[PDB]
Amino acid sequence: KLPEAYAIFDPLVDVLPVIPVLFLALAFVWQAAVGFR
Amino acid sequence: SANLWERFCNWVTSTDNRLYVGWFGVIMIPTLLAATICFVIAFIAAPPVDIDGIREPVSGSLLYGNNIITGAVVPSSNAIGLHFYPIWEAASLDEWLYNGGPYQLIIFHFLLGASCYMGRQWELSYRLGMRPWICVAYSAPLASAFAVFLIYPIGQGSFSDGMPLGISGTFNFMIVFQAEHNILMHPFHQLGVAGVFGGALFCAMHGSLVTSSLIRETTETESANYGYKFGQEEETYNIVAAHGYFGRLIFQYASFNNSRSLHFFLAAWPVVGVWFTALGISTMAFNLNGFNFNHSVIDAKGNVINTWADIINRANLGMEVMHERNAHNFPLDLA
Amino acid sequence: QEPVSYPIFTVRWVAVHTLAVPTIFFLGAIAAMQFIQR
Amino acid sequence: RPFSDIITSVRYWVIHSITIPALFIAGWLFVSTGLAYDVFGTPRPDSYYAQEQRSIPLVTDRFEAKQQVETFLEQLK
Amino acid sequence: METLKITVYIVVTFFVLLFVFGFLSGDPARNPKRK
Amino acid sequence: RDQESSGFAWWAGNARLINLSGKLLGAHVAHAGLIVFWAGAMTLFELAHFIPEKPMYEQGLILIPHIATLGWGVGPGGEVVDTFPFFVVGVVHLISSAVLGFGGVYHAIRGPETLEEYSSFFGYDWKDKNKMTTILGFHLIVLGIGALLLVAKAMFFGGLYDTWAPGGGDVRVITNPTLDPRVIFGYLLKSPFGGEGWIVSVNNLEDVVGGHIWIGLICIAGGIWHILTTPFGWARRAFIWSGEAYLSYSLGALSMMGFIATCFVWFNNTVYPSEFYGPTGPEASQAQAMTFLIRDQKLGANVGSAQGPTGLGKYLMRSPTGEIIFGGETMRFWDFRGPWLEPLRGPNGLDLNKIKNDIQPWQERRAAEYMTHAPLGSLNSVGGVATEINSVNFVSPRSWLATSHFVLAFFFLVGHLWHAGRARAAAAGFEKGIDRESEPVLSMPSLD
Amino acid sequence: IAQLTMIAMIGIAGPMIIFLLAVRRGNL
Amino acid sequence: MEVNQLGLIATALFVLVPSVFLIILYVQTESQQK
Amino acid sequence: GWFDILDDWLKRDRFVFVGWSGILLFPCAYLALGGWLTGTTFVTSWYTHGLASSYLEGCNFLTVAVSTPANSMGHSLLLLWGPEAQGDFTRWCQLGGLWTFIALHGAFGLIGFMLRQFEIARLVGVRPYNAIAFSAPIAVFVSVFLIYPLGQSSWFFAPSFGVAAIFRFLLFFQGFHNWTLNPFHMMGVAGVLGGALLCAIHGATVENTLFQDGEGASTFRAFNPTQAEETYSMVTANRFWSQIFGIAFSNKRWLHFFMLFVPVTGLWMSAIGVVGLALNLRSYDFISQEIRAAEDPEFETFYTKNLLLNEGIRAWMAPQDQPHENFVFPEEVLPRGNAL
Amino acid sequence: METITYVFIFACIIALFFFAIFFREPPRIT
Ligand code: CLA
Ligand code: CLA
Ligand code: CLA
Ligand code: CLA
Ligand code: CLA
Ligand code: CLA
Numbered sequence A: 001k002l003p004e005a006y007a008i009f010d011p012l013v014d015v016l017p018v019i020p021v022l023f024l025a026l027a028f029v030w031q032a033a034v035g036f037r
Numbered sequence B: 001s002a003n004l005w006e007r008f009c010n011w012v013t014s015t016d017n018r019l020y021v022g023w024f025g026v027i028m029i030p031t032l033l034a035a036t037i038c039f040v041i042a043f044i045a046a047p048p049v050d051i052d053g054i055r056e057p058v059s060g061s062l063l064y065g066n067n068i069i070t071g072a073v074v075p076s077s078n079a080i081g082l083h084f085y086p087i088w089e090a091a092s093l094d095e096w097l098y099n100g101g102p103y104q105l106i107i108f109h110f111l112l113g114a115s116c117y118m119g120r121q122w123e124l125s126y127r128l129g130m131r132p133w134i135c136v137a138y139s140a141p142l143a144s145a146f147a148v149f150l151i152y153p154i155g156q157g158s159f160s161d162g163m164p165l166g167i168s169g170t171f172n173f174m175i176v177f178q179a180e181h182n183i184l185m186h187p188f189h190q191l192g193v194a195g196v197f198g199g200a201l202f203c204a205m206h207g208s209l210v211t212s213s214l215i216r217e218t219t220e221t222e223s224a225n226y227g228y229k230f231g232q233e234e235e236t237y238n239i240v241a242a243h244g245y246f247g248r249l250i251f252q253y254a255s256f257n258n259s260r261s262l263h264f265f266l267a268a269w270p271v272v273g274v275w276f277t278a279l280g281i282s283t284m285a286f287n288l289n290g291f292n293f294n295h296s297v298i299d300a301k302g303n304v305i306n307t308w309a310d311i312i313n314r315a316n317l318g319m320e321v322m323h324e325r326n327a328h329n330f331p332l333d334l335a
Numbered sequence C: 001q002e003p004v005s006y007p008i009f010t011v012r013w014v015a016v017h018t019l020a021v022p023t024i025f026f027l028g029a030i031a032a033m034q035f036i037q038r
Numbered sequence D: 001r002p003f004s005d006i007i008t009s010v011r012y013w014v015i016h017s018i019t020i021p022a023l024f025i026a027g028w029l030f031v032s033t034g035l036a037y038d039v040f041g042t043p044r045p046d047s048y049y050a051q052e053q054r055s056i057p058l059v060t061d062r063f064e065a066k067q068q069v070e071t072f073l074e075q076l077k
Numbered sequence E: 001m002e003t004l005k006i007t008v009y010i011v012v013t014f015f016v017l018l019f020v021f022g023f024l025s026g027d028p029a030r031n032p033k034r035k
Numbered sequence F: 001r002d003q004e005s006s007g008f009a010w011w012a013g014n015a016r017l018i019n020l021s022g023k024l025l026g027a028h029v030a031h032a033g034l035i036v037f038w039a040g041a042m043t044l045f046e047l048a049h050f051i052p053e054k055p056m057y058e059q060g061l062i063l064i065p066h067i068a069t070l071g072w073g074v075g076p077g078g079e080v081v082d083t084f085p086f087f088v089v090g091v092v093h094l095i096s097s098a099v100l101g102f103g104g105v106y107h108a109i110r111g112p113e114t115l116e117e118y119s120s121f122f123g124y125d126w127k128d129k130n131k132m133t134t135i136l137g138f139h140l141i142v143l144g145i146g147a148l149l150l151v152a153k154a155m156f157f158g159g160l161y162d163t164w165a166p167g168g169g170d171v172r173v174i175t176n177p178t179l180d181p182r183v184i185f186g187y188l189l190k191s192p193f194g195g196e197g198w199i200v201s202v203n204n205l206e207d208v209v210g211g212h213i214w215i216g217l218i219c220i221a222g223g224i225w226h227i228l229t230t231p232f233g234w235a236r237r238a239f240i241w242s243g244e245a246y247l248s249y250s251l252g253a254l255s256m257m258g259f260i261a262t263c264f265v266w267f268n269n270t271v272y273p274s275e276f277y278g279p280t281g282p283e284a285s286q287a288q289a290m291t292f293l294i295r296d297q298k299l300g301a302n303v304g305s306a307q308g309p310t311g312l313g314k315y316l317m318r319s320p321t322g323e324i325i326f327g328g329e330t331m332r333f334w335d336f337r338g339p340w341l342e343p344l345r346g347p348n349g350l351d352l353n354k355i356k357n358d359i360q361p362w363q364e365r366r367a368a369e370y371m372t373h374a375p376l377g378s379l380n381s382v383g384g385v386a387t388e389i390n391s392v393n394f395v396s397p398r399s400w401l402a403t404s405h406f407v408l409a410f411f412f413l414v415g416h417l418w419h420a421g422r423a424r425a426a427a428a429g430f431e432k433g434i435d436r437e438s439e440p441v442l443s444m445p446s447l448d
Numbered sequence G: 001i002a003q004l005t006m007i008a009m010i011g012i013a014g015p016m017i018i019f020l021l022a023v024r025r026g027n028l
Numbered sequence H: 001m002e003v004n005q006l007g008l009i010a011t012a013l014f015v016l017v018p019s020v021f022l023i024i025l026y027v028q029t030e031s032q033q034k
Numbered sequence I: 001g002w003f004d005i006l007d008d009w010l011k012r013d014r015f016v017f018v019g020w021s022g023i024l025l026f027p028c029a030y031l032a033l034g035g036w037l038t039g040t041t042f043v044t045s046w047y048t049h050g051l052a053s054s055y056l057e058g059c060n061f062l063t064v065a066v067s068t069p070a071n072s073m074g075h076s077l078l079l080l081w082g083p084e085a086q087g088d089f090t091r092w093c094q095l096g097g098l099w100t101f102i103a104l105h106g107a108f109g110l111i112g113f114m115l116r117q118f119e120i121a122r123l124v125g126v127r128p129y130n131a132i133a134f135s136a137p138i139a140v141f142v143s144v145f146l147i148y149p150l151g152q153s154s155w156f157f158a159p160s161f162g163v164a165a166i167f168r169f170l171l172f173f174q175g176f177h178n179w180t181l182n183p184f185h186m187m188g189v190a191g192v193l194g195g196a197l198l199c200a201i202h203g204a205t206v207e208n209t210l211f212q213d214g215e216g217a218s219t220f221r222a223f224n225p226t227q228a229e230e231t232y233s234m235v236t237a238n239r240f241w242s243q244i245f246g247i248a249f250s251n252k253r254w255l256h257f258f259m260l261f262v263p264v265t266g267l268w269m270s271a272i273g274v275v276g277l278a279l280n281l282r283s284y285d286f287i288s289q290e291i292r293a294a295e296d297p298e299f300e301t302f303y304t305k306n307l308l309l310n311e312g313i314r315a316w317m318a319p320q321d322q323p324h325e326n327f328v329f330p331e332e333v334l335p336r337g338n339a340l
Numbered sequence J: 001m002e003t004i005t006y007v008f009i010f011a012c013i014i015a016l017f018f019f020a021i022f023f024r025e026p027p028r029i030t
């Protein structure tokens, strides 16, 4: 699957693809924190 | 004097015409006139059409013994496929009609013209110095018309699997569609019906709330509608009364108080809904089907217990077995 | 708003509390159903 | 009156963090001890059939409906 | 049936040419404001 | 600036960047990082689950096949012999993403918010026509260089996976691409309707690499052209020069490209192979038919003159022209050309004699494996239509790509409608509503 | 040995950046 | 096939008598004044 | 005395109003909702049809229902204290007592809301058009959930509260009555799509003829709730629409009344349609077509395809959809397309 | 017999469109 040395980071690799959607959520977090200008 | 081009070009864009006709119009009008002629003639005096390419014609013409409900323009043949099939690619007009010729002839012009109509709405709004995006709202029925007449044929791979141009034929289309893909368990079709039911609902309650708040300029022998004299500078009801009515009905926070928000929302709900179901048909053309639950409840003996989804699957199997005259043997199909 | 001569529990009190205890009791029961083997 | 006034007062926490876990646990224990199966009489997934009655139970009279279903539950189906 | 191909092509071509020449002909100042 | 002194609510916030160049630059060079990040992250995620002796289309890989088409990590017949190119492509994209994002956060918060006072070559104006044509010229040149990279891969660096090679596909090097404009522009004169087909109708990699040379150099010449030229009068009277008009045109372009892409990925099988993505739409029907014929022929039945329970053939039929094609409802597909089906096609459709004696093993097993794996499935990924039971799970990669790019294209069309309307209305100046005192209709003759 | 330690950390990574700029008051 | 000649009379009266009702109502009020 | 006290404590202004209608509305509505929520959660339908329809049995949210009573109950209401459960709660749950419970209590909750709308309108001092408009869903409710099973032999053929159970109703109606080919349903569908058509277009026209009164591109902030000056150019809307389509409103009062009129009438005409099916009077055939398809066997129309399909729906759904008949059909008498 | 009744009604509906558009009652501002 992944070379045997990096195999330890098999969970780290599984959590990579959902990092993009979070940016769009963070932008709403940001906006509510400054109280919506 | 000025030369014929300048005269023509301001005759076209004339916004003092009784009816606008743009640069989109000069290409809209022939295509739709042709569409109208071919529909009126073909619904009435067409010969029967071999649609299954194994020599069983279907009559859809009134003159060969149909009424309004059963009549239709019968789709192009399974043998013809996705081919371009005009009058001059046939050996004779006789066999062009035999292969469901007029069906292609109505729909290409009609889809083209319906887009040119979308263009014309923008042009008239641009000439009247008013805001655009009535044309953005027109993209919803238009995209559903495309999906049903052009995308779903490409996807299934022939124009025989189009929707015939008629009432009972439309019903035939729905019933075979449900059997072969189960559209009711597709979440997108569920948002489409929500948008239509909610759209109809918001129309009714909007109508009642505004007509119940109208001012007194009338009497009780002349209709209420002669309170508006055309193009008043005085809005013809009191928003805070309706708001105060709605605000006791559900609550104070469940009642809009900005007519501009209310009307934006009034326009936004069904349009998003209709997009979603139009796309739903379009993805089913590539054969991304509704959810299918076979036996969600099984016990310890390992024997199944039915669900309502199973009763629906029995019906689907019934319809689908009837829509296959092509053989008894069909193992993994479509298409 | 809910009255200003203030009965000890008002009308809002029963409205939130007929919809508070069943849904807490229900999403504790529905969650337990998930861990039934079947 | 706004939720802001409700989300802060200590008496709100001193009732709630005490009542809600009891309700959560009452709701959990209600299904997990199998009591929901007896008070609603819903079958367990080893009691839909029996080894002498391999068809669906069906009520066919409406004044002995009670007795008919009690017969099906008495024979361990 | 061969004449039919040619006269349909000519008609179609005539309309699409009016269209393009019409949109090259001074359309962004046909608005009632800022002409 | 950054409150309601700008003329946009929070849900239109990105529109406050129409007149700030640096803040806008930071926004885009930061977003590029996301596209790259997903490329790398997704192929690493796919590879962590990849079984490299199981065909790619039955496990959901949709980024490894693009690399496989370039003939990296594959042997003959489309098997994996080593998995290193997958890892290195993914990890180097994921690493370069950071470098992009770093430039993002810097130009957005630390950089000058206006680049016209800072630089006069990164200083630009949407109403300055010359700057736009020069930037467009740069961008055409880096796209021209980008188009010649594939030609390099084709001719020097081990070529591409040719699926038309003898005995199933094999990686083959192009040693002679067409440089013949006749053939090249001939594709653009074909009818889009079935039977013929537009640029989608490509059937060999010589035309592909040849056309890549052609488009590359027309855009290097055009890119050089827009640095050394100022737009003309009729060109200036045909347009609205506004920072939003360019966006409208580009949305129009992207929606057209999505419609074309979803047509490609559904029908072609030269640039989207049949050994890395599943069979195509007609390919499974034709396969079912072909393996049925082969099965029933071994019983010694007459299949060559066999008439149906509605007549007109039982295994084979006549097309309109008179070629021998497949019967039943496989009579709407005979525009299908497969690599595996073509050695059997005579001079006018299939020749039943070639069927009896010239069956090679890989052909009949290709036909048999493709029969039970036809583009269908549901949105919770289990094979078949709504009558059959959940016991096999299939969703062609073709359907995922087709459905996604279709709905994104429809939405990019309606976005082009929106932004064209805004740009046109804002130009003339009634996009904030209709001025009270004077209105057009109050100065226009009343219809009767 | 835990590797769930970074899946813990990586979900709070975002708002911690904003939380501190709201402690250090300036440019949210 | 069949056409029903009482069904003919059925439509004929259905579309006549109200169109005639409406055309008289519209004509007498327009024939009067201011 | 005490009456006018009970009056002004009820009719007082509060975050949410109660009134005399509150006394009928709130218990009935709350019990009906609550019943459905416990029925979808714990209650089986295995002693009635041979289905599972609850989370306790393992069904998801797309396949649960509070299912109808059994066929042998007739049209009995099945009261808890009555001589079909005799003071017993468990059997009462098994025999489908919750369906009727929910149906009756929801039927009174509808009357409560209807009355509530009248009362709030009489209080605020506006016309009661919203209550007249709200009689269309009650017409539909009592025509589909009450009159239709009372025309048949039991509650068993009524729709069960649940999404898939309503889907099965759609297929049942199509299969046995050919419901789309009845003109009252045509009129209802038209009325409802026309309501939806008017919604999108009216919103789009008002929102795209707004005056300039703001400073930002968004015009949502240029509105004050007062009616002193007009908020959209009606004249412009009329001039636009009379030119692109040919006819236009030039009377707001009439436009809003047309909006009220189209879907409420649609639903009323459809209610007349489903009470027509309760006697099994159903538009299903045109006799001219049968005699023609009898004398000529190579005549085909889409209508004949629809009747063959109706055969398929019925013959294949009947076994598990009518278990109380204990139907058994051999595998050789089921209808098949390929046998034609 | 049946076809005539149908087409006569369709013919009446399109004539009504023409009359309704080009011979309307003219809406006029006050
Ligand atoms: C692709 C390029 C592109 C670019 C660069 C722009 C740029 C812009 N647009 Mg445009 N637009 C586009 C495409 C594009 N658009 C398309 C395709 C459409 C059709 C929908 C639109 C429709 C549109 C409208 C209607 C408007 C704009 C507006 C704007 C401006 C402000 C936008 C803003 O702040 O939103 C901030 C964005 C949000 C608050 C949206 C958040 C969405 C969330 C919560 C959920 C997203 C879910 C996702 C779609 C589904 C998949 C999720 C996944 C996790 C599985 C900005 C200049 C505005 C303007 O001023 O226009 C002139 C305005 O009114 N745009
Ligand atoms: C990929 C999406 C995207 C991008 C690239 C941007 C970019 C930007 N937006 Mg937009 N926006 C977006 C989505 C996005 N936005 C969406 C979906 C919405 C809807 C809510 C908005 C709503 C919105 C509004 C209302 C406004 C902006 C504004 C801005 C600018 C803010 C600059 C600033 O001071 O930030 C300050 C912010 C921070 C200090 C906190 C965020 C921290 C950042 C920079 C990093 C986070 C990611 C990560 C951990 C960094 C790793 C770095 C590593 C590689 C080394 C900036 C150029 C503003 C603007 O136009 O002003 C002129 C403004 O008022 N945006
Ligand atoms: C692609 C988008 C892009 C653009 C348009 C810019 C534009 C700019 N950047 Mg940025 N930058 C980017 C991406 C980008 N950057 C990325 C990805 C990062 C992370 C590495 C950075 C990080 C960065 C920083 C931190 C700084 C800049 C600076 C500059 C400014 C330089 C002014 C000058 O006189 O330069 C004159 C220099 C040149 C003309 C030559 C540059 C050669 C280098 C550095 C790169 C070459 C790359 C590649 C090999 C080119 C191949 C071309 C090929 C066709 C043959 C300019 C406005 C500085 C500035 O003042 O910004 C305001 C500053 O502080 N850049
Ligand atoms: C002086 C010339 C010049 C050059 C050469 C470039 C070069 C580039 N600009 Mg550009 N730019 C310029 C001036 C210039 N800029 C000016 C004056 C402005 C106005 C401020 C901008 C504003 C601008 C913006 C806003 C953007 C670009 C983008 C791009 C990139 C396009 C990538 C691409 O097409 O992806 C497809 C890929 C290819 C065709 C392959 C490229 C192969 C070559 C030629 C380069 C590869 C090596 C190089 C170091 C880059 C590596 C990228 C990495 C992520 C892998 C490219 C690196 C965009 C971008 O991607 O930035 C992140 C973007 O959003 N430009
Ligand atoms: C792809 C990106 C791109 C973009 C955005 C532009 C943008 C522009 N270019 Mg340009 N150009 C490009 C690439 C690009 N160019 C390349 C790569 C070449 C080299 C081959 C050229 C060669 C070129 C020339 C020769 C000229 C421009 C000019 C212009 C301006 C045209 C103004 C106008 O209204 O034309 C509108 C044009 C038309 C309406 C005629 C179109 C005729 C054709 C191509 C199609 C007709 C429609 C037909 C039905 C389509 C059938 C397709 C079929 C296959 C189905 C505009 C600023 C002009 C200018 O002022 O430059 C400064 C100018 O003289 N360009
Ligand atoms: C105001 C709200 C209200 C209303 C209208 C009803 C209405 C109804 N309930 Mg319900 N119920 C309610 C509140 C309400 N309930 C509450 C709060 C609870 C929880 C305690 C229940 C719990 C309940 C259960 C468990 C059930 C019902 C059932 C029923 C139905 C059966 C008939 C019945 O009991 O009528 C209610 C009223 C009466 C029977 C009698 C009223 C008598 C009055 C007005 C005067 C009597 C005068 C005098 C003493 C007569 C003397 C005669 C003598 C001289 C011979 C009916 C639709 C059953 C049902 O739906 O089955 C399908 C059922 O299962 N009820």
Ligand SMILES: CC(C)=CCC/C(C)=C/CC/C(C)=C/CC/C(C)=C/CC/C(C)=C/CC/C(C)=C/CC/C(C)=C/CC/C(C)=C/CC/C(C)=C/CC1=CC(=O)C(C)=C(C)C1=O
Residues within 6 Å of the ligand: B039, B040, B043, B068, B167, I186, I187, I188, I190, I191, I193, I194, I195, I197, I198, I201, I202, I203, I205, I206, I234, I237, I238, I241, I242, I245, I247, I248, I249, I250, I255, I261, I262, I263, I265, I266, J010
């Ligand atoms: C050979 C041929 C051609 C044969 C014919 C084939 C064929 C199928 C014929 C059709 C006959 C057929 C079978 C009919 C069946 C159904 C039928 C009889 C239905 C009528 C009965 C019915 C349902 C009654 C109750 C419900 C009802 C009234 C429904 C009507 C729905 C409907 C279509 C409504 C109209 C919608 C519509 C397009 C409105 C546009 C309004 C408009 C001009 C708005 C613009 C506008 C908006 C503004 O906001 C403002 C401000 C202004 C100013 C303004 O202007």
Ligand SMILES: CCCCCCCCCCCCCCCCCC(=O)OC[C@H](CO[C@@H]1O[C@H](CO)[C@H](O)[C@H](O)[C@H]1O)OC(=O)CCCCCCCCCCCCCCCCC
Residues within 6 Å of the ligand: B091, B092, B093, B094, E001, E002, E003, E004, E007
């Ligand atoms: C009923 C619907 C009417 C709608 C009316 C309104 C809209 C339409 C308006 C336009 C209508 C008229 C369009 C023009 C019709 C042209 C006549 C026509 O079809 O004739 C061509 C038709 C074709 O005849 C067709 O032939 C077929 C076999 O090929 C089949 O038999 C067809 O059934 C038969 O229709 O022939 C005739 O009408 C008789 C022979 C005429 C010979 C003289 C023709 C002109 C000769 C010089 C030009 C030759 C051009 C081709 C060669 C180019 C050089 C190589």
Ligand SMILES: CC1=C(/C=C/C(C)=C/C=C/C(C)=C/C=C/C=C(C)/C=C/C=C(C)/C=C/C2=C(C)CCCC2(C)C)C(C)(C)CCC1
Residues within 6 Å of the ligand: A006, A009, A012, A023, A024, A026, A027, A030, F027, F030, F031, F033, F034, F037, F091, F094, F095, F097, F098, F100, F101, F102, F104, F105, F108
């Ligand atoms: C502006 C803004 C924004 C946005 C932003 C963005 C868009 C950004 C992005 C950026 C980016 C785009 C970033 C990224 C990052 C990344 C990184 C930093 C990475 C790292 C990595 C590494 C280091 C690697 C490692 C490894 C290896 C090497 C191998 C194996 C595996 C592993 C993984 C372990 C928001 C809206 C929010 C807010 C407002 C403002």
Ligand SMILES: CC1=C(/C=C/C(C)=C/C=C/C(C)=C/C=C/C=C(C)/C=C/C=C(C)/C=C/C2=C(C)CCCC2(C)C)C(C)(C)CCC1
Residues within 6 Å of the ligand: E019, E020, E021, E023, E024, F183, F184, F185, F187, F199, F202, F207, F208, F209, F211, F212, F214, F215, F238
């Ligand atoms: C062979 C081949 C190839 C290539 C090809 C090519 C060579 C292409 C080309 C391309 C092209 C060649 C394209 C084109 C396009 C075009 C367009 C898209 C259009 C334009 C125009 C316009 C858009 C216009 C507009 C207008 C009008 C019309 C009117 C007036 C005004 C205006 C301006 C508005 C490839 C690679 C695939 C590979 C394989 C094969």
Ligand SMILES: CC1=C(/C=C/C(C)=C/C=C/C(C)=C/C=C/C=C(C)/C=C/C=C(C)/C=C/C2=C(C)CCCC2(C)C)C(C)(C)CCC1
Residues within 6 Å of the ligand: C018, C019, C022, C023, C026, I030, I031, I033, I034, I035, I037, I038
């Ligand atoms: C039967 C009966 C009765 C009654 C009872 C009751 C009244 C009950 C109630 C109950 C209840 C009252 C319940 C409730 C529950 C709840 C639930 C079931 C909920 C759910 C929720 C959810 C599921 C959520 C979701 C969401 C949302 C909403 C938003 C967004 C986010 C989310 C998605 C998360 C009586 C005793 C009289 C008698 C006997 C019989």
Ligand SMILES: [Cl-]
Residues within 6 Å of the ligand: B176, B322, B323, I305
């Ligand atoms: Cl069929």
Ligand SMILES: [Fe+3]
Residues within 6 Å of the ligand: B206, B210, I202, I206
């Ligand atoms: Fe309105």
Ligand SMILES: [Mn+2]
Residues within 6 Å of the ligand: B156, B161, B180
């Ligand atoms: Mn089909």
